[PDB]
């Protein structure tokens, strides 16, 4: 690959420069090259990987939603063709991320933090595939997302405190999955509420800085709860 001759540390350094320049495609490519060196990612490096691909797929998702809306209002081939082009590129990025997770990053071994982080990510990228899928293929993609989120949930509940920000962000996204993808708003609401309440009760154990990290994600859970109810 094009990054094979570059030092791991240089790839990480350049990912950080790409982030400063808001060049998220480059950032993702550098982080992919770093993953392919075959060493575990540190906590900081996991976040770089995630931010990079979140921004790439985020732009594609937003464009797909614009084009899908135009296509639905119209219902020549041009709108469908271009929506399909964007859709295919989006699916390709999701497949790239899922491939990195399955081939390099998800392991039976692992500290809870990393295992939960990557399983949540797998759930997220199957969820993005589910947003553009139809029919029976959608059903299989939905169950893949569910399975990844559920495994991450089981680990997080056993191995992490209820205020852990990774655990909280996982619950937030799994509850969004229930509401937006799986047609299970009651499960979404129940998960958000129990997660929020169980974190609230443990805030007293946290330092000022950890309190801010946890409460910011708790606030997102509450925003969704108040939207939904």
């Amino acid at each position: 690959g094009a990054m094979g001759s570059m030092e791991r540390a240089s790839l990480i350094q350049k990912a950080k420069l790409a982030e400063q320049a808001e060049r998220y495609e480059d950032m993702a490519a550098f982080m992919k090259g770093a993953v392919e060196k075959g060493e575990e990612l540190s906590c900081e490096e996991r976040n770089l990987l995630s931010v990079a691909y979140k921004n790439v797929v985020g732009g594609q998702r937003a464009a797909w939603r614009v084009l899908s809306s135009i296509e639905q209002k119209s219902n020549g081939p041009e709108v469908r063709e271009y929506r399909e082009k964007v859709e295919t590129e989006l699916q390709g990025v999701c497949d790239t991320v899922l491939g990195l997770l399955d081939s390099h990053l998800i392991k039976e071994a692992g500290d809870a933090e990393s295992r939960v982080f990557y399983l949540k990510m797998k759930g997220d990228y199957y969820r993005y595939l589910a947003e553009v899928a139809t029919g029976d293929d959608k059903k299989r993609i939905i169950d893949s997302a569910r399975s990844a989120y559920q495994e991450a949930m089981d680990i997080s509940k056993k191995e992490m405190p209820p205020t852990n920000p990774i655990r909280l962000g996982l619950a937030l996204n799994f509850s969004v999955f229930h509401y937006e993808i799986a047609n299970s708003p009651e499960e979404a609401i129940s998960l958000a509420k129990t997660t929020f309440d169980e974190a609230m009760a443990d805030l007293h154990t946290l330092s000022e800085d950890s309190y801010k990290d946890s409460t910011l994600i708790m606030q997102l859970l509450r925003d969704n709860l108040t939207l939904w109810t």
Binding site: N173, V176, L220
Partner: peptide, 7 residues
């Protein structure tokens, strides 16, 4: 859609 984790 409902917002997901912004990061």
């Amino acid at each position: 859609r409902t917002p997901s984790l912004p990061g």
